[PDB]
Design a binder for this molecule. Structure first.
Ligand SMILES: *[C][C@](*)(C(*)([O])=O)C(*)(*)(*)([N])C(*)(*)([O])=O
Ligand SMILES: *[C][C@](*)(C(*)([O])=O)C(*)(*)(*)([N])C(*)(*)([O])=O
Lengths: 227, 227
């Protein structure tokens, strides 16, 4: 009966891998009928998120979301947007469409409250420009913001490696480096692509790092979260 | 602009992995905007397909499809059902809903015509009961039907291993065995789960076997097939 709608494609590789996680972390006992009921709107054609801010038409982007939320509100019970940045348009949307919503920022916020140690916000320059975490989280004093320099190095990783579907473990060495620099053993997948990393770490059984990955957190607690 | 709708979840593991293939086999050059626009209805709760035939209510199952096709006809340009068996309900659906459809049986049929050697139809007992390939394919004389005995051994693989998300390569030895028995170096993923195998073979670079996997064939030729 209960159905999740996912407005994704903003990271189509991640979008796919996220759905894969949902069934990985909710494997049925006897019958498939048991398993999670998901709807995925995978639209890569969504106007570039970090590039919609740096041009005149954020107007075009907000429309995209509104249109697709109007659809998903009918077909789903709960709704998730598979892009953190993308949440920046939610001020502009009428409150009725956001009734079913589950903020990736709120999920990250709760996770960080329980973990309760300083944690590095891994996000692109454009994700940071929107200040979604600094405004949105109650646990904001525990968030370590990257330097503008390192935000661009993370922009490289996301777009040049992760988004292109290459092995997430390749960037691991560069991420371990940052973690020592900013002096934590933990990260927030500000940019959703780090769902891909989060998995690859768990797969390798590398427990040295604590990952606050909202998409993992959703997948795992699907049975609870979806009403 | 062009959008594919996928009525899936009949194999939720496959459904996820299929979407992953779409982006694996259509990796963008410069911008993600380029990439494939997909909608996925992943509903595991679809009444058991092989078990809907062996009870009174195939009536319940046909409704499920019709309802979801009515939806997808609005939101998509082309439509695919992520289950071969599931095509057995298409006689009962009004022709207007099937205007956008892409038959997994037709795709398998074309592929087999070009390959043009005897090829083993790997499918469950229930998939066979519906005789979808024997009636649907023009290339039907090239299809080698499994023995009823071996259909149940494939039922085991599908449900006990593949559907439960375990490594598809584990069954490989048992599949190589069948291929030698029925005396081919080729197979048809009658049951869609063998998308999972098809990938795992390609990943390993095992070219000894020729796989007629419709879901691979769709993913690869997305740019062409979707109008
Ligand atoms: C901005 C990035 C994206 O996917 O468009 C990032 N993954 C995000 O939104 O969190
Ligand atoms: C019957 C099986 C299923 O997925 O329900 C098989 N994968 C098929 O339909 O091809």
């Amino acid at each position: 009966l209960p159905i999740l709608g996912v407005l994704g494609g903003m990271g189509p590789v991640v979008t796919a891998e996220f759905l894969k996680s949902i069934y990985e972390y909710n494997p049925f006992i006897d019958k498939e009928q048991e398993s999670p009921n998901v709807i995925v709107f995978s639209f890569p054609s969504a106007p570039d998120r970090t590039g919609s801010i740096d041009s005149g038409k954020e107007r075009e982007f907000i429309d995209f979301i509104q249109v697709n939320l109007e659809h998903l509100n009918k077909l789903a019970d709960c709704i998730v947007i598979g892009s953190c940045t993308a949440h920046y348009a939610l001020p502009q949307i009428p409150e009725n469409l956001k009734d079913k919503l589950i903020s990736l920022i709120k999920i990250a916020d709760q996770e960080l409250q329980e973990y309760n140690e300083p944690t590095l916000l891994l996000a692109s320059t454009g994700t940071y420009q929107k200040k979604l975490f600094q405004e949105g989280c109650t646990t904001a004093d525990l968030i370590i913001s990257l330097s503008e320099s390192d935000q661009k190095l993370i922009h490289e990783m996301i777009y040049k490696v992760l988004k292109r579907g290459h092995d997430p473990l390749s960037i691991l060495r560069d991420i371990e480096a940052l973690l020592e620099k900013y002096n934590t053993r933990s990260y927030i997948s500000g940019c959703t692509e780090f769902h891909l990393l989060t998995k690859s770490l768990k797969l390798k059984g590398i427990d040295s790092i604590k990952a606050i990955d909202p998409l993992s957190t959703i997948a795992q607690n699907f049975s609870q979260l979806i009403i």
